[PDB]
Task: inverse folding
RNA sequence: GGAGGUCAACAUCAAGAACUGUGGGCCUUUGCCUAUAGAACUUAUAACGAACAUGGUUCUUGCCUUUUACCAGAAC
RNA sequence: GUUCGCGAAGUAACCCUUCGUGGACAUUUGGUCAAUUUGAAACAAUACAGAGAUGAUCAGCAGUUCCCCUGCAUAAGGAUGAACCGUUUUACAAAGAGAUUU
């Protein structure tokens, strides 16, 4: 369905017009599985029309909340260190392609190239012992039936040293207010009053 | 309108001989060829492993007005076309019962909404008068009864009757029916002598 | 394929999703080719998605870096009011834009503490959240809009369109129904059949009597029957009140 | 006979004519596969292909399945499947016409639906209100590349071309008007020969423009109107009377 | 529109105006479910009735109609008035209707006419 | 007389069933997916005897449904043979 | 039988602080009183979602050439 | 193809093969739709004019219509969107007067 000039594809063209009710949903389900800075490339589970009209990514991204807080804190610290370390940071130019260039095919120009290096703040070997081997995976303990229910990835339960390690490692994004008398006249109900 | 739509009328020659058929109802499928207006298209198949799929083509108003099938366009009683049914009704009782056929796409979708049972369907929509005119057709049927140069060909006989008789009396044939110069030509002169011998 | 079904072949939709004409249009053609808010809103959404997917493509081909990727798409989600042009089709989205701009202020002065002024932030989680929450709100709206557009494509326009009485057509509708109301009450007074050509000549006294009311001229008709003058004087006092 | 050999492939799939036709206008439309900002009043051309009824015809895949219908592209001259084609690849004879009889009332020999009334210009498929059997051949001066050819020879070439596509009831070439009226004996032969001989030529190799036949326009086969010849009208009335008597016999025997 | 009646037992509205039709609105989905197409002028009055002459209307073409709302056609047209019927009324304890004209007040039975 | 308490009930039930069938059809032909959560909920014999089974088909969600549907302008033949009589009685203006 | 599923269907999820079932009595079924068995999930700086968008109608405003598109408070 | 048997043959000795053989498992896809002219989108170019109530130049709101186009539209635009400007005879009678005939 790159070029469709036949008496065939009279139905497929009408399908292409019919899918435009459904393009915000396909854009949403694509964009909310934007990979993350600590990943190279992730495989999504898509659902397409047989004539090739629209292609919905059919997958919801579930994360553990302290593990995700610690992942964003690691890449926060690494991006700060890299901004300090570089003298010349080349912010890329926009829009990235020419206007008359068709989008290049994944199967030829992209898939045969070996990927590049993600953010990945380098962890210590013994201070970060319990979380080192899985901190930067896609679903970090997707198959470890003691620390997760299953590959449906719905519930989580950790020990104390793993949880403490994620507590220390996520220092730049913790709340760090432990008394409720901090929000004396900034609570929700003072705002309503 | 469509909350009480009549069931279709499919010809018994169209449904086939299998005693159980499944047919698909699509509530606004095609639009009618006579009526220009939507209807509920049905598309069955005769046996399950038949090759082709019969579908209905005309509306149910348009089928009832002509007293015809939908898949077949034939008269639902006698199983003949409309144009020959109107000739048989017109030839006996002498009424010129001919069916009126509308152009101007407003006028055809006007005519399809009135309920008048168009020209020759008034007789065969009832069994009594449809049997009476067959009784009269009995009376009309009772009162009823290598190259050769052809010449004096009858003015209304075609080439293929000549060729079929020669294939019985056993190629090419060029017959101008005006000048009657029937320039028959066989493929072998032995076949020419054969045809000369048989006559 | 929508543009080429509609008959518009002189509009060019290049691969970065811009719609520009290939010639200088006539006015008849500019009437035939005003695409709606719905088309251009879908078009700018596809453009935005295109920019994000192209920057991850650039990361894959090895032209850019992990940090330049993160800074690039952080810049993208912050600068949609300059990179796309969605603000002009659904101006409510300026809320989302101002939110992203405000979020930049509270992220940069946590990021740029003790390290200068350059590019390279790339903490794109909160801006990403803002644009996803915009998308789930404009799913049902754009399904409604594109549903009506595509059914006008396949199925024409409904001929049954009636006009709501608005501010624009109120002083006309008052006239239509005033004259119907007058002509009924005068048709009932007559002992004859009026046969209908006379009615439109009877209402000219209603028009003349209103013109005489505005100009404060007393409106006596010399050979007028009495209850018909009473009816007209009644309805003109109504209109004047 | 054609019952022996399997049907030869007529042209390869790679050697098929492409779409995106002819570069007529300026900009190409996509939803309709045609050209826009354009100028067009001719849009016709000589068809490159033609069937050879003795060389090409034979058994196929969907002849063992008993399909009623004939291949449109076998007739037009470009059927690129051969022994694998679903449809039939031979000229309609009495046996094949006898099987189509329930379906020819509604739709074509090729299986296409007949509309209520013909067209502005007597176009492609027939009308189901009338069993027309006479075809109008015209545009002969474009079909011969303006080779003036002593009209009895033109009638001989039109005789020979249609003699292979079925049985002929009668042939007439008109002197005053460059046209011919060809009546077949059955209807399916008329439908087959109409779609088989559209956009073709009358030239055949020893005719001095055989290498140059591809330029031009090619002839038109359309549907003939009613004949205003009163001899033809009285012949039609007599044939209608005899068909009426036959159907009277059958309707009396079904009571 | 110049007229509202409310159905006694079925959650409907019947309205009418210069449109020359009667619209029988569903009350929940606000859909114009059944449209009664009979008259030849604006309708002045519409009365709702719980048994089969269920809608009784009166237009300015000197007719009064008793409608079958399930079928969609008219049960009976009353043509006795000479001019426009401007006012009607249902009787609370009688199952009869009264129709007024320019000087012609009559009383009609329902379920026969 | 006033109409009896049973005929009010029979009329109310029959007409309520009819109005609910019309409302379900109007909400089921709509393009809104949200309307089908507001609806409130074959074999036929084609001749002397044939016993057919009418099944529906499952359609593509992207292709248009009711492909015959289109906006047309129609006139209707106003046809009657009920003659009905008009039963009337027998310079200043 | 056991573990699991980015598998499906069907019930259910915001209310006298609030649920269902059963036996007995009173009224004449509903309801009231009395004795009993069970209640998963959600909820008290109140709610399924330590997250948070858009649409309609009617008021009150703000930009002010008019309508879309809008400014930002309220009720449904 | 798998599995449970039931016989023969090779080594046998209770296994392992070749072979025949009864049972079990698994059971009807797809088409409303064929691949350039002949079954149906349309605009655009050259030529003429250069927008309604006008003496002249304009703001508009409507209406009726088997005309619609752009539009998310029940908003609003399309020259006040446009067409509207023509053709017009019988519910025909009463009184009086002047000539023709009986
Ligand atoms: O938006 P841009 O013009 O591209 O520049 C913005 C930003 O503008 P806004 O604050 O208006 O979004 C600031 O520039 P100012 O107009 O406030 O001076 C800011 O500067 P500060 O750091 O001084 O706040 C910062 O520039 P920098 O990259 O130096 O942080 C940043 O640039 P980005 O566009 O790269 O975020
Ligand atoms: Mg106007
Ligand atoms: Mg307007
Ligand atoms: Zn029809
Ligand atoms: Zn073939």
Result:
């Amino acid at each position: 369905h790159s070029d469709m000039a036949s008496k065939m594809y009279n139905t497929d063209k009408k399908a292409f017009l019919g899918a435009l009710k459904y393009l915000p949903h396909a854009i949403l389900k694509l964009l909310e599985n934007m990979p993350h800075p600590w990943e190279q490339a992730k495989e999504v589970k898509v659902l397409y029309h047989t004539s090739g009209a629209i292609t919905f990514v059919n997958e919801t991204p579930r994360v553990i909340e302290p593990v995700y807080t610690a992942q964003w804190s690691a890449t926060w610290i690494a991006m700060r260190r890299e901004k300090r370390d570089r003298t010349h940071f080349k912010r890329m130019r926009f829009p990235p392609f020419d206007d008359d260039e068709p989008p290049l095919s994944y199967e030829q120009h992209i898939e045969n190239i070996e990927p590049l290096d993600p953010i990945n703040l380098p962890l210590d070997s013994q201070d970060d012992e319990y979380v080192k081997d899985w901190l930067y995976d896609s679903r970090p303990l997707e198959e470890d039936s003691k620390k997760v229910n299953g590959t449906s990835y719905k519930k989580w339960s950790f020990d104390l040293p793993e949880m403490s390690n994620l507590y220390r490692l996520s220092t730049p994004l913790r709340d760090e207010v432990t008394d409720k008398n901090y929000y004396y006249l900034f609570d929700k109900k003072s705002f309503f009053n | 309108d469509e909350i009480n739509e009549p069931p279709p009328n499919i010809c018994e020659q169209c449904l086939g001989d299998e005693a159980n058929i499944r047919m698909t109802k699509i509530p606004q499928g095609s639009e009618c060829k006579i009526c220009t207006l939507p209807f509920t298209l049905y598309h069955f198949k005769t046996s399950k492993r038949s090759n082709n799929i019969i579908k209905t083509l005309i509306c149910v108003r348009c089928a009832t007005q002509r007293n015809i099938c939908q898949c077949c366009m034939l008269d639902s009683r006698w199983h003949i076309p409309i144009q020959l049914r109107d000739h048989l009704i017109s030839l006996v009782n002498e009424e010129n019962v001919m069916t009126e056929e509308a152009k101007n796409d407003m006028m055809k979708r006007f005519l399809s909404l009135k309920n008048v049972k168009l020209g020759g369907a008034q007789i065969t929509s009832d069994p009594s008068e449809a049997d009476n005119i067959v009784d009269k057709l009995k009376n009309i049927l009772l009162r009823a009864t290598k190259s050769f140069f052809l010449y004096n060909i009858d003015a209304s006989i075609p080439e293929w009757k000549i060729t079929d008789t020669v294939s019985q009396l056993l190629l090419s044939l060029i017959v101008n029916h005006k000048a009657k110069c029937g320039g028959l030509r066989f493929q072998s002169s032995e076949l020419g002598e054969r045809f000369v011998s048989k006559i | 394929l929508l543009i080429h079904r509609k008959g518009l072949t002189y509009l060019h939709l290049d691969y970065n999703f811009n719609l520009k004409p290939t010639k200088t249009l006539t006015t008849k053609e500019r009437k035939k080719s005003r695409l709606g808010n719905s088309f251009h809103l879908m078009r700018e959404l596809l453009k935005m998605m295109k920019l994000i997917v192209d920057t991850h493509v650039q990361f894959r081909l090895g032209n850019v870096d992990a940090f330049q990727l993160a800074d690039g798409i952080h810049y993208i989600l912050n600068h949609i009011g300059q990179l796309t042009g969605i603000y002009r089709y659904k101006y409510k989205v300026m809320h989302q834009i101002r939110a992203c701009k405000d979020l930049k202020h509270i992220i940069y002065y946590k990021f740029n503490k003790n390290l200068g002024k350059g590019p390279g932030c790339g903490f794109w989680q909160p801006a990403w959240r803002v644009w996803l929450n915009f998308l789930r709100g404009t799913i049902p709206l754009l399904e409604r809009y594109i549903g009506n557009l595509i059914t006008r494509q396949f199925e024409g326009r409904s001929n049954e369109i009636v006009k709501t009485t608005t501010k624009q057509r109120l002083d006309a509708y008052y006239d239509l129904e005033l004259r119907n109301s007058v002509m009924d009450d005068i048709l009932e007074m007559m002992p004859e059949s009026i046969r209908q050509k006379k009615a439109r000549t009877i209402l000219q006294h209603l028009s003349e009597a209103w013109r005489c009311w505005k100009a404060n001229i007393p409106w006596d008709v010399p050979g007028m029957p009495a209850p018909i003058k009473k009816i007209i004087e009644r309805y003109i006092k109504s209109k004047a009140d | 006979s054609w019952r022996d050999k399997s049907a030869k492939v007529q042209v390869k799939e790679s050697e098929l004519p492409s779409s995106i036709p002819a570069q007529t206008g300026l900009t190409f439309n996509i939803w309709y596969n045609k050209w826009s900002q354009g100028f067009a009043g001719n849009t016709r051309f000589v068809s490159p292909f033609a069937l050879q009824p003795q060389l090409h015809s034979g058994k196929t895949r969907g002849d063992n399945d008993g399909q009623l219908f004939f291949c449109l592209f076998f007739a037009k001259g470009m059927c690129c499947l051969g022994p694998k084609c679903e449809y039939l690849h031979h000229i309609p004879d009495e046996e094949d016409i006898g099987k189509l009889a329930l379906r020819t009332e509604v739709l074509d020999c090729f299986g296409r639906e007949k509309f209520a009334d013909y067209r502005e210009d007597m176009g492609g498929i027939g009308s189901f209100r009338k069993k027309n059997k006479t075809l109008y051949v015209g545009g002969i001066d474009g079909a011969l590349n303006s080779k003036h050819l002593k009209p009895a020879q033109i009638e001989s070439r039109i005789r020979f071309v249609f003699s292979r596509l079925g049985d002929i009831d009668r042939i007439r070439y008109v002197e005053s008007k460059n046209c011919g009226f060809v009546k077949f004996k059955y209807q399916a032969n008329a439908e087959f020969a109409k779609e088989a001989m559209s956009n073709q030529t009358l030239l055949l190799p020893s005719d001095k423009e055989w290498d140059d036949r591809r330029e031009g326009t090619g002839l038109l086969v359309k549907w003939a109107n009613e004949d205003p010849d009163p001899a033809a009208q009285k012949r039609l009335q007599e044939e209608l009377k005899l068909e009426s008597l036959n159907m009277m016999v059958h309707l009396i025997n079904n009571n | 529109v110049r007229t509202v009646s409310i159905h006694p037992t079925l959650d409907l509205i019947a309205t009418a105006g210069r449109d020359s039709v009667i619209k029988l609105w569903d009350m929940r989905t606000r859909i114009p479910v059944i449209t009664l197409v009979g008259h030849k002028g604006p309708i002045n009055q519409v009365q709702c009735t719980p048994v089969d002459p269920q809608v009784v209307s009166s237009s300015t073409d000197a007719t009064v109609r008793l409608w079958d709302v399930v079928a969609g056609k008219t049960m009976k047209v009353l043509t006795h008035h000479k001019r426009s019927v401007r006012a009607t009324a249902l009787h609370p304890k009688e199952f009869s209707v009264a129709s007024a004209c320019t000087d012609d007040i009559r009383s009609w039975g329902l379920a026969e006419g | 007389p006033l109409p009896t308490k049973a005929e009010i009930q029979e009329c109310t039930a029959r007409t309520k069933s009819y109005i609910q069938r019309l409302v379900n059809a109007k909400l089921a032909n709509s393009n809104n997916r949200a309307s089908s959560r507001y609806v409130t909920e074959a074999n036929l014999l084609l001749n002397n005897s044939h016993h057919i089974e009418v099944v529906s088909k499952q359609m593509d969600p992207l292709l248009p449904r009711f492909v015959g549907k289109k906006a047309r302008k129609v006139v209707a033949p106003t046809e009657n043979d009920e003659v009905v009589p008009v039963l009337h009685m027998d310079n200043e203006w």
Summary: The pocket of inositol hexakisphosphate (ligand 1) is lined by residues C 101, 104, 108, 112, 117, 119 (CB under 6 Å). Chain C touches chain D through six residues (CB under 8 Å). Residues 125-155 of chain C form the longest helix (31 residues). Residues 37, 88-92, 94, 96, 129, 132-141, 144, 166-168 of chain C lie near RNA strand G (CB under 10 Å from a C1').
